[PDB]
Structure formats: structure tokens, C-alpha cells
RNA sequence: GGCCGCGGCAGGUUCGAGUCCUGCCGCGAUCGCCAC
């Protein structure tokens, strides 16, 4: 099985084990002691002060709160600072906001550096509305925690779960504010199988309305969109698997999917029977975190599927990978050749100043007369994908993404056939082509 | 870094470009939006 029945043994997958839990208060009394020491503005933020966080992602978010009148500089350099005192031993690797990662007594720790406000409503940083989810959320998340990890679990199983731009999922936030919301993940669920592109879900006030597009409303800032970073398709998705479950409960739904070893020979049988032009675009990977190298895949891939389009080698779909040393970009086309020849438009028979300047131009040939007006037979200067792709990278790679394109720029080469299955691509590969029976949630 | 705008300014392609492609610059009041 029944539909409780499930949920009960999902419960075993998505709770902490209290051997992890111990793990996590001891790191937390250690944290607060060095903190305290210190004697700096701090608050506990995130799904382990709210004790919502997923069984195997135990992450302590801690948020030093500063002065408004500090410079972006000043916060950087002192929240830095006081990270890298605190943390056994740490990294730093950030974006757009300065903070540092680390460990504490084998757990993982966030410091972020924040401005101490009153009222979030013009805010100085991104990061200043989370000490302010904190405060709004303790008090009505209590009870339903559990109701909020089997919503993350729900998420991460079926990969999309996550904010980031690796994923552009639900955010761990997003979840929480859905459960106090609707109350329970089943009613999270049966209500979420009637959502649309243009559903707005106002926590603050109770009320579900249409918009211009899916818009969870902060209770903090009415502005700001919770769900801001949630892909359409990534909706779809949510929404799709929410019509499945409820037609038919299982505790599938829960189990992390991975990919199969799918054998180069059964590949090569794969893109034959299709008779399709499978390549790929490799390139060295730029070294940058992944909220900025994602867009930029996200980019290279679409302006390269886009130029495929406009040269009628009809691309079916796209796709990349970022291994560790090299970044692929992969596609898939109907038309492996065309012909040389295409017909270009020329004028109208009357307008003679026009129509002599059209057959001045020399061709191989001849033009003609068609339904009132010149045409000619031109030729392209590549027949097929490939060739058009050597192109197109080799002079337009300003525009694919700044990092990407200077690392197109510097080298890249395209790879086609089987020489690209022996590639760390076919995951891929099978996601972009519907291949079926390529992953499994076997233990 | 990516994305959305009002704008323009050149260049490329074409018989023909406000309209397709590329390069550059200005301004977004919720210091335009996202990433924690
Ligand atoms: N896209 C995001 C990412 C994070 N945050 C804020 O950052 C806090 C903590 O960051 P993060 O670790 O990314 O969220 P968690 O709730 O801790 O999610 P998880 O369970 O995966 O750790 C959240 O409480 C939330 O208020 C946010 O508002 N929007
Ligand atoms: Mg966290
Ligand atoms: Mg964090």
C-alpha cells in the first residue's frame, strides 16, 4: 505494498542511523567551542540545524554574521579568516560569495560570511535571507522533518534534487517550505500531479495562484523566487514522477539509479540501427568550479546545436560530460551528408536592377526562372556534420561560453565512431539516445 | 560566470538585412535575475 506501506520503508533509506548523528553533535560541540573561543557573531543554518538533512549527506552550514557597514572586502578577508581557524583542515573554492569548506572531527563544515541584518529586505550579499529562512522555519518545521526527507530522498533518487547549476533541482529550502505547505511528502505529492508552468505557491499566505511562471514565494522576501534555479523540464520531470507514484506505489522511487557498462559492440549496434551521426566535441576542461563551467557547457552545446539546425543536418538531440581532465560536448544528427549543391532565393523577374545583379554573380551551374522568380544552384563548403563542426569551432569559439571557448580555442578535436564508445561518455550516450535497460538501482 | 531586458554602434552573409550570424559599448532600482 500500500501506499504507507512504502513510505514506511523508505523511511530506512532517507533517516539518519544515530551512529552518523552522534557523528554530527560531537563535530557541532567541537564547532561551537572554537567559535565561541573566537568570540564572533555566528548562527547554525541549513538542514542540520533544522534536523532535516538526508542519511549520508551530513553537512554543517555555519553563517558569521558582520557588520553592515563592512566592505565586500572586509567580509571576505575576515570571513576567511576566521573558516580557516576553525576548520580542522579546509579548501577554498568559491564563486561569486567567498566561504570556506572543510572538515571538522571527519564531518563536513560550510563557514559563510554574512552581513548581520534587521529586516531582509534590502539585502547587501545573496546570502543574507538564510539566517532569516532559519528563523521563520524552526518553528513550523517542527514535527515534519521526516516529511522533509523523504522529499529530499524522493528528489535525490531520481537526480533532481539541488539547486546548483550542475542539477537546477529543487533546492533544500524549496523542500521544506513544500512540506509546511501541504503538511506531508504524500500530500506533496498528490497536489504537485496538477501543477503547471505558471503555478505560484505563496507560503506566506496560504495561496496557490497563477503567474508568468513556477514561482514559490520566499515568506522572507516576497520578491524573491525560491524556486528560481528549477529547470522547466526538471518540473516536468517532478511532476511526471509524482503521476507514476501515486498510480502505482514503489519503494523504486527511492533508489538511487546508476548507469550499466554498456558494451562498445552493443553501442555500435545501437547508433547503426539508428543511422544516425553520433560525435562528440573534446576539449581540455577549464579549471573553474562547476556553477561556472556548467552555463558554459549549457552554452557551448546549445550554440553548436543551433548551427546544425540552420545547416540542415537536422540534430535530434545534445549532450556533455566534464570528466576530470577533459569536457565533451556530444550530438546526434539525422543527415550524415548532404549534398554540395543547395538553391539560394534571387529576385523577381520585374525589378531588373536587382535581377542583373543575381546573375552577374558567377556559378557553375546556371540560374532559372521558378513560380515568378530567379533562383541558382550554390555550393556549400561542408557536406557533413563533422566537417561543419571543425568549422564552426575552430572560428566561432569566442561564443561558446568565455572559459570553454578559450579552451576550445587552445585545442579540441572531434571524435566519431567507435573510437568516442571507448570514451568516459556512454552514460551519456544512452540517456541522449533513449537507450533502454542502461541503469539499475541494484544494491 | 550564465541568463533576461530596453537600447544602440559597426562588421559578416545576401539581388536585398530593423528581421539571419558575429564583435563592441551604454543602462537595468528589487544596487535586473540566478548560484549559498
Ligand atoms: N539555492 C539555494 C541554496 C541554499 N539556500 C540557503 O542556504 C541554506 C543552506 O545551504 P544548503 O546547504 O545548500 O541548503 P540545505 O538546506 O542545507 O540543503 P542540504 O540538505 O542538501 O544540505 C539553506 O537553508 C537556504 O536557506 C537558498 O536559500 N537557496
Ligand atoms: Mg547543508
Ligand atoms: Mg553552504
Redesign the pocket.
Do not use: C, L
Given at each position: 505494498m500500500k501506499v504507507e506501506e512504502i513510505l514506511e520503508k523508505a523511511l530506512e533509506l532517507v533517516i539518519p542511523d544515530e551512529e552518523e548523528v552522534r557523528k554530527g553533535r560531537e563535530a557541532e560541540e567541537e564547532l561551537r567551542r572554537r567559535l565561541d573561543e573566537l568570540g564572533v557573531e555566528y548562527v547554525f543554518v541549513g538542514s542540520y540545524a533544522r534536523n532535516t538533512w538526508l542519511k549520508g549527506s551530513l553537512e554543517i552550514?555555519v553563517f558569521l554574521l558582520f557588520p553592515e557597514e563592512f566592505s565586500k572586502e572586509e567580509l571576505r578577508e575576515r570571513g576567511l579568516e576566521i573558516g580557516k581557524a576553525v576548520l580542522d583542515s579546509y579548501e577554498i573554492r568559491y564563486?561569486?560569495?567567498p566561504?570556506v569548506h572543510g572538515v571538522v572531527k571527519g564531518v563536513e563544515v560550510?563557514v559563510?560570511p554574512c552581513y548581520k541584518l534587521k529586516e531582509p529586505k534590502?539585502i547587501?550579499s545573496?546570502?543574507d535571507?538564510?539566517p532569516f529562512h532559519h528563523k521563520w522555519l524552526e518553528g513550523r518545521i517542527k514535527g515534519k522533518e521526516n516529511e522533509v526527507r523523504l522529499l529530499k530522498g524522493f528528489l535525490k533518487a531520481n537526480g533532481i534534487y539541488?539547486?546548483?547549476?550542475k542539477v537546477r533541482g529543487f533546492?533544500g529550502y524549496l523542500c521544506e517550505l513544500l512540506i509546511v505547505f501541504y503538511g506531508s511528502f504524500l500530500e506533496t505529492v498528490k497536489n504537485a500531479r496538477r501543477w503547471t508552468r505558471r503555478t505560484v505557491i505563496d507560503v506566506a499566505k496560504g495561496e496557490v495562484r497563477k503567474g508568468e511562471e513556477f514561482f514559490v514565494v520566499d515568506p522572507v522576501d516576497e520578491?524573491?523566487?525560491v524556486a528560481?534555479?528549477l529547470s522547466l523540464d526538471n518540473l516536468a520531470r517532478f511532476v511526471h514522477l509524482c503521476r507514476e507514484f501515486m498510480e502505482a506505489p514503489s519503494l523504486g522511487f527511492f533508489k538511487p539509479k546508476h548507469p550499466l557498462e554498456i558494451e562498445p559492440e552493443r553501442l555500435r549496434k545501437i547508433v547503426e540501427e539508428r543511422g544516425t551521426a553520433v560525435f562528440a566535441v573534446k576539449f581540455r576542461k577549464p579549471d573553474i568550479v562547476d556553477?561556472?563551467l556548467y552555463?558554459?557547457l549549457?552554452?557551448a552545446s546549445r550554440?553548436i546545436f543551433?548551427f546544425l539546425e540552420?545547416e540542415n543536418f537536422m540534430p535530434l538531440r545534445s549532450a556533455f560530460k566534464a570528466s576530470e581532465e577533459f569536457c565533451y560536448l556530444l550530438f546526434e544528427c539525422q543527415i550524415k551528408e548532404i549534398s554540395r549543391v543547395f538553391r539560394?532565393?534571387?529576385?523577381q523577374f520585374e525589378d531588373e536592377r536587382?535581377v542583373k545583379?543575381?546573375l552577374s554573380?558567377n556559378r557553375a551551374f546556371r540560374p532559372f526562372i521558378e513560380n515568378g522568380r530567379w533562383w541558382?544552384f550554390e555550393m556549400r563548403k561542408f557536406t557533413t556534420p563533422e566537417e561543419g563542426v571543425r568549422s564552426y569551432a575552430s572560428t566561432?569559439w569566442?561564443?561558446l561560453?568565455?572559459?570553454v571557448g578559450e579552451s576550445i580555442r587552445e585545442y579540441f578535436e572531434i571524435i566519431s565512431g567507435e573510437k568516442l564508445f571507448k570514451e568516459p561518455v556512454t552514460a551519456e550516450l544512452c540517456e541522449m539516445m533513449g537507450v533502454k535497460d542502461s541503469n539499475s538501482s541494484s544494491v
Open positions: 552550514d564563486a561569486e560569495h566561504y560550510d559563510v534590502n547587501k545573496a546570502v535571507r538564510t539541488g539547486a546548483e547549476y533546492s520578491k524573491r523566487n528560481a534555479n556553477d561556472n552555463p558554459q549549457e552554452r550554440k543551433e540552420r539560394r532565393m534571387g529576385p536587382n545583379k543575381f554573380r541558382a566561432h569566442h561564443t561560453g568565455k572559459n
